[PDB]
Amino acid sequence: SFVILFVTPLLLLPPAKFVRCAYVIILMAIYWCTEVIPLAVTSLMPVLLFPLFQILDSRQVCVQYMKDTNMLFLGGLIVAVAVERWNLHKRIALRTLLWVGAKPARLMLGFMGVTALLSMWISNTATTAMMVPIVEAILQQRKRLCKAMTLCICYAASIGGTATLTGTGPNVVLLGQMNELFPDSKDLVNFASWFAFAFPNMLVMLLFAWLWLQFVYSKKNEKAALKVLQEEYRKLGPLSFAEINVLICFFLLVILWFSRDPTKYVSDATVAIFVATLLFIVPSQKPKYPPPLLDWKVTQEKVPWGIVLLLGGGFALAKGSEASGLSVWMGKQMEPLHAVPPAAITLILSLLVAVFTECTSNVATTTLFLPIFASMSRSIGLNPLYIMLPCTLSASFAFMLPVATPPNAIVFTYGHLKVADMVKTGVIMNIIGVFCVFLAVNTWGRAIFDLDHFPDWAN
Amino acid sequence: SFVILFVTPLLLLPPAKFVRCAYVIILMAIYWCTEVIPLAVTSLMPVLLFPLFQILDSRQVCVQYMKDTNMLFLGGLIVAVAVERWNLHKRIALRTLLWVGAKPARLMLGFMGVTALLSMWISNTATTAMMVPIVEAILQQRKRLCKAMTLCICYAASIGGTATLTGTGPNVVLLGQMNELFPDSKDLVNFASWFAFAFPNMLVMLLFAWLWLQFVYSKKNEKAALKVLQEEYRKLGPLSFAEINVLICFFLLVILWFSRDPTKYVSDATVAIFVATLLFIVPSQKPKYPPPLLDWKVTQEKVPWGIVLLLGGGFALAKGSEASGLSVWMGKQMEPLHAVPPAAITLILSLLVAVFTECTSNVATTTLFLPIFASMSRSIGLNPLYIMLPCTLSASFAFMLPVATPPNAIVFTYGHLKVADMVKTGVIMNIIGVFCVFLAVNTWGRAIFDLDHFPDWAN
Numbered sequence: 001s002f003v004i005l006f007v008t009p010l011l012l013l014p015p016a017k018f019v020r021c022a023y024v025i026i027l028m029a030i031y032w033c034t035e036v037i038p039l040a041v042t043s044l045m046p047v048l049l050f051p052l053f054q055i056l057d058s059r060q061v062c063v064q065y066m067k068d069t070n071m072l073f074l075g076g077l078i079v080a081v082a083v084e085r086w087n088l089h090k091r092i093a094l095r096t097l098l099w100v101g102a103k104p105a106r107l108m109l110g111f112m113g114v115t116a117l118l119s120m121w122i123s124n125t126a127t128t129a130m131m132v133p134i135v136e137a138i139l140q141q142r143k144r145l146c147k148a149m150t151l152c153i154c155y156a157a158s159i160g161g162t163a164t165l166t167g168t169g170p171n172v173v174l175l176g177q178m179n180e181l182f183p184d185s186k187d188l189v190n191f192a193s194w195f196a197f198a199f200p201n202m203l204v205m206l207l208f209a210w211l212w213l214q215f216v217y218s219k220k221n222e223k224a225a226l227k228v229l230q231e232e233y234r235k236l237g238p239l240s241f242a243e244i245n246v247l248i249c250f251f252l253l254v255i256l257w258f259s260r261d262p263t264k265y266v267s268d269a270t271v272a273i274f275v276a277t278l279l280f281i282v283p284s285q286k287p288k289y290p291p292p293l294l295d296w297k298v299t300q301e302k303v304p305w306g307i308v309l310l311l312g313g314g315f316a317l318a319k320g321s322e323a324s325g326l327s328v329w330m331g332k333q334m335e336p337l338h339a340v341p342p343a344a345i346t347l348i349l350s351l352l353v354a355v356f357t358e359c360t361s362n363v364a365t366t367t368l369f370l371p372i373f374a375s376m377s378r379s380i381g382l383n384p385l386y387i388m389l390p391c392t393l394s395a396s397f398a399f400m401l402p403v404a405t406p407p408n409a410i411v412f413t414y415g416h417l418k419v420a421d422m423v424k425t426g427v428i429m430n431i432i433g434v435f436c437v438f439l440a441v442n443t444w445g446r447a448i449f450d451l452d453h454f455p456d457w458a459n
Numbered sequence: 460s461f462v463i464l465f466v467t468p469l470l471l472l473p474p475a476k477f478v479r480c481a482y483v484i485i486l487m488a489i490y491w492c493t494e495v496i497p498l499a500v501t502s503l504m505p506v507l508l509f510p511l512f513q514i515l516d517s518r519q520v521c522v523q524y525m526k527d528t529n530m531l532f533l534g535g536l537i538v539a540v541a542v543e544r545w546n547l548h549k550r551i552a553l554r555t556l557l558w559v560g561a562k563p564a565r566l567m568l569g570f571m572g573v574t575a576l577l578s579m580w581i582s583n584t585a586t587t588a589m590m591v592p593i594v595e596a597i598l599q600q601r602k603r604l605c606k607a608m609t610l611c612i613c614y615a616a617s618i619g620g621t622a623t624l625t626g627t628g629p630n631v632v633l634l635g636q637m638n639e640l641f642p643d644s645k646d647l648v649n650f651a652s653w654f655a656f657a658f659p660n661m662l663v664m665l666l667f668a669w670l671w672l673q674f675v676y677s678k679k680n681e682k683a684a685l686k687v688l689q690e691e692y693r694k695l696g697p698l699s700f701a702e703i704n705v706l707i708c709f710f711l712l713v714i715l716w717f718s719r720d721p722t723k724y725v726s727d728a729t730v731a732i733f734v735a736t737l738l739f740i741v742p743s744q745k746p747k748y749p750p751p752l753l754d755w756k757v758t759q760e761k762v763p764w765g766i767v768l769l770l771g772g773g774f775a776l777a778k779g780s781e782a783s784g785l786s787v788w789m790g791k792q793m794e795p796l797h798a799v800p801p802a803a804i805t806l807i808l809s810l811l812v813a814v815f816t817e818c819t820s821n822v823a824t825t826t827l828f829l830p831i832f833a834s835m836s837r838s839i840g841l842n843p844l845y846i847m848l849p850c851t852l853s854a855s856f857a858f859m860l861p862v863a864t865p866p867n868a869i870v871f872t873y874g875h876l877k878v879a880d881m882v883k884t885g886v887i888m889n890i891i892g893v894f895c896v897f898l899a900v901n902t903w904g905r906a907i908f909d910l911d912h913f914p915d916w917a918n
């Protein structure tokens with residue numbers, strides 16, 4: 001019930017400041033999981049609690065809620081608002097789905113491919129919310145097949161969101177906590193390096209996911225799917241000038257992000273804000289003044305400001321952990337794991353994060369777990385990335401439960417799914433994801449991020 | 460046109476870093492006034508431009524957009540969302556309007572009083588947007604009288620918003636820039652001290668405004684107004700449990716704000732966030748779990764995140780002015796005004812700000828002008844508050860033009876007003892406001908803020 005979580009754990013207030021910060025973290029974790037209050041309010045919890053518990057005054061807590069990473073996230077969100085306003089993502093989805101074909105096997109393959117492609121660029125939640133009505137209409141035109149399609153959309157959304165930093169919230173959390181916890185790691189993790197690490201691993205996960213979903217789960221089906229896709233594409237309209245301009249702005253954003261990393265002042269946030277500003281200037285109509293691609297009304301009503309606040313609250317939580325001495329204490333506690341081989345530690349932590357992310361949101365999961373794992377990484381003399389990157393990727397492995405991720409909730413909302421079949425698929429899904437992430441880290445993540453040696457920025 | 464402002468001043472890019480920061484400030488001022496791009500995007504301009512012009516890297520610019528003041532503003536906005544969701548402000552307005560009476564003179568007096576009272580607590584824009592439909596319905600049930608009522612609503616909204624820090628955006632700007640430009644002035648300006656300074660001055664302005672509007676501008680009118688107010692109050696419904704809980708939470712917020720100032724960790728932002736969090740916990744319905752007073756959907760759709768970004772951009776602009784050396788250069792330039800008596804300087808600056816605020820938004824006006832005036836204040840050895848407080852109050856004197864403030868735009872939207880009559884009223888309005896602010900500063904502002912002596916925090 002709500003009363004038991006509102007009263008009993010909250011009234012546990014009385015010690016050492018690290019104990020108080022640990023209590024703040026535990027209370028925020030409980031509010032993340034149970035969601036008695038909204039996620040944004042739980043992320044505002046540090047502003048209330050750190051000054052009260054004498055860990056950080058209001059100034060230091062408040063200056064954590066908007067950072068370089070958070071501004072980059074906001075710029076990406078504004079660009080995504082531009083993409084969704086003009087149905088560019090829907091156009092790409094329908095065009096590629098008509099290209100791949102409509103026979104059921106190729107149909108599922110195409111849906112997963114387009115969902116993962118658009119998730120690399122748009123929020124997992126928004127990509128799912130756009131894609132799942134398409135299969136809803138197609139299936140409206142077999143219980144096993146409905147499960148297969150609706151599931152594979154949510155799974156592909158999560159997997160594809162893992163590909164880029166701005167694709168999903170856990171990656172933004174990872175970037176922000178890398179800046180917060182390891183300031184001397186200036187640009188080691190960026191759009192180019194993260195893409196190089198995660199895109200092959202995303203492709204491997206998507207391939208195994210499609211194979212598994214085809215393992216567990218006709219002319220008429222092909223014809224009906226082709227008809228629905230053709231109808232949707234027609235009513236979408238011809239390729240407009242605004243859609244072309246949004247596409248050009250997004251290509252420019254991607255090109256600048258990738259060319260930033262083939263005294264540094266310009267960052268990925270500068271590029272994202274530049275492209276968003278262009279979206280507020282570039283005309284949306286035939287010049288022949290026409291309205292721009294974006295106005296502030298739609299931008300404000302479509303940007304998830306709650307997620308912005310949640311990222312800021314995660315940064316404040318990491319700052320409080322460093323200031324209160326909690327990170328040092330946790331490192332001292334997890335020190336005797338130095339004897340354990342790092343591969344086993346990565347397996348166990350990835351499995352633990354994949355289990356935990358089935359209960360609360362992925363972003364909250366990675367927010368809670370990244371500081372602890374970073375503290376252990378500097379405790380046992382291990383490269384923090386070798387622990388955090390598998391943790392960040394596994395936080396997105398929200399496969400078992402509808403409450404695991406908003407894509408899963410959207411997918412469950414339409415029906416067609418028991419929790420039993422979803423968890424039966426999701427357990428092998430999590431096993432596959434952990435395997436793929438383990439290989440990605442142990443093989444080519446080593447070369448990309450120099451996971452062999454203990455870095456200087458980790459002291 | 461849009462092209463001339465998008466191309467010609469923007470393409471002036473080439474010098475010294477202070478010149479580049481001055482160019483950034485001038486470009487942002489032009490975008491504020493003309494509003495070719497939305498205000499939030501113009502406030503994001505520092506993130507794009509300071510790294511490009513080598514003034515501040517993206518990290519330092521981005522850590523300015525959420526501060527203690529900005530979090531306090533957000534908490535106040537959330538509390539205001541709670542107030543507007545349950546029509547508590549409308550209930551207070553209708554109850555007090557029925558208490559004061561409906562005869563035309565007392566009717567205008569009551570409307571101005573309730574508008575100023577609710578503006579002390581709610582945004583000027585939101586207070587105006589709620590109040591003006593009431594007089595629209597009343598007048599629906601004389602051109603001079605319509606002008607009088609619609610005007611006095613907007614003027615009372617601005618004047619009442621001057622009363623508290625969270626009442627209007629310029630006061631939030633003043634608090635934020637006082638923290639940014641004068642860090643050693645920790646809590647000199649706070650809710651209690653600002654209220655003590657501005658409430659008597661707000662009352663004086665409102666009294667003279669009512670007198671002037673009665674100077675320039677029956678039983679049937681009284682009966683019709685009373686009938687409309689009674690109808691609105693009936694359809695408002697009886698005093699609900701949620702309304703009482705929102706009222707109690709707001710009283711608690713006010714009491715904590717005033718009792719904060721009869722190593723400091725708790726600030727006004729901590730109190731505001733605490734009360735907002737309570738609003739997300741406190742039940743809105745008879746317990747007999749019922750939904751809380753606020754959920755995040757309405758909070759996100761009702762909070763003006765653009766204004767949050769604009770305040771952050773103002774803080775970043777002040778930070779860039781300090782870092783680039785522009786503030787020092789401006790102080791050197793305005794040094795030879797040390798011979799001018801401070802009272803004359805205050806008069807001229809208040810008149811200049813009152814003139815400028817007729818063109819762009821009040822918040823943008825005070826954002827642009829406060830750093831320059833602070834630099835001059837430390838140039839000529841004058842108390843910065845003696846210049847900034849009249850500047851902050853005069854920024855709210857948006858009386859002449861509909862584009863001067865969103866309350867003025869809302870008021871002009873309903874009609875009943877030429878620009879000619881509005882400016883004719885507004886010129887004497889600005890004269891009255893400047894007079895009242897001059898007296899407030901020269902008399903009791905001196906005692907409250909120690910305006911006589913050059914403070915230590917101003918170096």
Ligand SMILES: COc1ncc(C)cc1CC[C@@](O)(CC(=O)O)C(=O)O
Binds near residue numbers: 166169404407
């Ligand atoms: C990029 O982040 C987001 N953007 C927009 C919205 C509306 C929500 C989010 C966070 C949720 C998630 O990160 C998945 C999860 O955390 O379960 C996702 O990518 O949709």
Ligand SMILES: COc1ncc(C)cc1CC[C@@](O)(CC(=O)O)C(=O)O
Binds near residue numbers: 620627
């Ligand atoms: C408290 O600030 C605000 N809150 C909410 C909204 C929607 C807008 C604002 C800023 C505008 C103004 O500050 C007046 C002006 O600047 O002209 C006001 O109080 O409405």
Ligand code: NA
Binds near residue numbers: 123125157160162
């Ligand atoms: Na995504």
Ligand code: NA
Binds near residue numbers: 356358360361395
């Ligand atoms: Na999750």
Ligand code: NA
Binds near residue numbers: 621
């Ligand atoms: Na107000």
Ligand code: NA
Binds near residue numbers: 815854857862864
């Ligand atoms: Na103005």
